[PDB]
Amino acid sequence: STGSATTTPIDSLDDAYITPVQIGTPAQTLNLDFDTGSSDLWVFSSETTASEVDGQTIYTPSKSTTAKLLSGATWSISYGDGSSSSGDVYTDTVSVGGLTVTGQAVESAKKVSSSFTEDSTIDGLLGLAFSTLNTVSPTQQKTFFDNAKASLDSPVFTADLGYHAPGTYNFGFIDTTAYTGSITYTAVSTKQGFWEWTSTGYAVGSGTFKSTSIDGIADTGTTLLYLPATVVSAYWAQVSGAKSSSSVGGYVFPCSATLPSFTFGVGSARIVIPGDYIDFGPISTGSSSCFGGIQSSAGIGINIFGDVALKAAFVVFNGATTPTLGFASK
C-alpha cells in the first residue's frame, strides 16, 4: 500500500504545516501537525476542557463506530517549546492520503496548554519519530508509520515541505519526479528516539564550506533551524545590523536586509537554504526588526534541523531495519 497527502502552511510565515487525517467511522477529518520529532498522535476532542478549545475541529469518539477505549491508558507530553497536552486513549481507524491503519492509538486531549488553544488551525499532532518516545502509559503505543510499515510497498515516508506553498507527505514510495539529482543517504542513530544524523558542515552565502560534524535531528515539528552558537554567529555576522536580543529571545535583523543563503552538508552533498527562507518577519506587528530563522541551540541540548532546513530538500525517512535519512535538492 501507499498514501499521499498534501501539507499546507498554517500562516504566511510557514510557522507549521497541517495535513488532513481521517479518523473513525464515518470519517472525521482533522488537520494535524505531522511531527518527526515526537511519537504521539493526539487530537483535540469532545473530552478537551471547553475553555481550552478555540476554533479547532474536535474528534468525538462516541460518534465513531470503530472507536474503542484503550482501558486504563493515559498520556502526557511536553514539547521543546514548553507547550504540553494530556488525556486518555482510544483505538480507531486512521487514514492519511488513502493509507489506512486499523487499531491506531488516538490520544484524546483532556487538557492542552495555551499555545495549542491559541492556534485554531492545528487540531492535533501526528508523531513520526520512533515509537520508543510514545508517552502512553502503562502500555506504550506505536506511531502511525510503525503500524503501517509492514503493509507499505517500501518501509519509508517522505517529507516535501513547501516555501510559502503547499507540499506533500508520501508513505510507502519515493516520488522520483519530486526532486532533482540524486538522494544522498546518511546514517541515523535511534538511541534518543529521534531521526538523529550528523551533518558534514556548512557554508554561509557564497563563502567556503567548513567541514565539521554537526549532530542533530530532522524535525518537521520545529519551525526553525537550531545550530551551535559558533555556526549561528558566523551566519549573522554576514548581515549588517543583526544581533542577538535577550529580550526578544534570539537573533534579530533589520527587515530591510537581504539575507544570505545557508548551506548544510549531507555526506559529500550540499543542501542550500535560500536567504528568504530565513526571514520570519517583524518581531511584532509593524516593527522594522525581523526575527531570524537560524537560531542557537545552546540552550536546547540538541541541534534541530527544523522546517527552515527541511523545506529546502526532499527528505526520505527510511524505516528499514537499519533506519537512514535521505536528502535531495528540489
Side-chain angles (χ1 to χ4, degrees), residues 1-62 64-67 69-109 112-141 143-148 150-190 192-242 244-330:
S1 61
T2 63
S4 182
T6 299
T7 194
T8 302
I10 65 165
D11 63 23
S12 64
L13 298 178
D14 298 347
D15 282 316
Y17 298 78
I18 49 172
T19 309
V21 177
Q22 282 71 50
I23 309 175
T25 309
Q28 300 179 39
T29 298
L30 274 65
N31 295 328
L32 305 188
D33 184 352
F34 282 25
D35 181 12
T36 63
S38 70
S39 306
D40 287 50
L41 192 178
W42 74 260
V43 296
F44 279 79
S45 75
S46 57
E47 303 180 329
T48 310
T49 299
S51 64
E52 295 178 351
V53 185
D54 185 5
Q56 295 81 11
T57 296
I58 64 165
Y59 170 58
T60 303
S62 68
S64 174
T65 59
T66 42
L69 179 73
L70 188 62
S71 185
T74 60
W75 62 279
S76 179
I77 192 162
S78 304
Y79 297 100
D81 66 354
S83 67
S84 63
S85 54
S86 60
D88 56 16
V89 186
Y90 295 81
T91 57
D92 211 338
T93 302
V94 171
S95 298
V96 175
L99 171 64
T100 300
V101 167
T102 59
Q104 175 63 46
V106 177
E107 302 173 35
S108 169
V112 305
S113 65
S114 56
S115 65
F116 289 114
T117 300
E118 290 161 3
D119 182 5
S120 67
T121 71
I122 290 177
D123 302 324
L125 268 66
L126 190 149
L128 292 168
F130 294 88
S131 294
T132 54
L133 293 179
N134 177 266
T135 78
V136 176
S137 179
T139 307
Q140 188 170 63
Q141 301 295 302
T143 70
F144 175 82
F145 178 55
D146 216 335
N147 281 322
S151 301
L152 295 178
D153 291 355
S154 180
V156 305
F157 69 90
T158 64
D160 179 10
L161 303 179
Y163 169 66
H164 296 170
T168 305
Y169 281 102
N170 290 330
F171 292 83
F173 72 106
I174 286 161
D175 178 357
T176 61
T177 75
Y179 59 88
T180 63
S182 58
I183 306 176
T184 298
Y185 289 87
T186 195
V188 165
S189 172
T190 65
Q192 294 191 87
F194 299 122
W195 292 92
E196 188 172 359
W197 65 290
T198 302
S199 173
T200 51
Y202 69 98
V204 174
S206 57
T208 62
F209 186 85
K210 174 74 167 179
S211 292
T212 186
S213 295
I214 304 171
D215 181 287
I217 66 168
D219 185 2
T220 58
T222 290
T223 312
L224 305 186
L225 174 53
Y226 294 89
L227 291 174
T230 50
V231 178
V232 176
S233 183
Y235 179 80
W236 290 109
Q238 297 305 310
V239 178
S240 288
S244 182
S245 168
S246 59
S247 65
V248 173
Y251 280 89
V252 296
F253 67 95
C255 292
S256 60
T258 303
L259 296 177
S261 64
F262 184 88
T263 299
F264 64 93
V266 182
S268 58
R270 306 288 180 253
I271 300 295
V272 180
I273 307 172
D276 286 353
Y277 288 27
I278 299 162
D279 182 359
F280 279 75
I283 60 169
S284 299
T285 306
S287 177
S288 72
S289 291
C290 273
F291 198 67
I294 295 177
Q295 297 294 345
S296 179
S297 66
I300 299 178
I302 197 160
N303 300 307
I304 307 172
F305 294 87
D307 298 334
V308 165
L310 303 182
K311 73 190 177 183
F314 177 88
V315 188
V316 180
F317 294 80
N318 169 28
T321 303
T322 298
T324 65
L325 280 166
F327 293 82
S329 294
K330 67 185 182 190

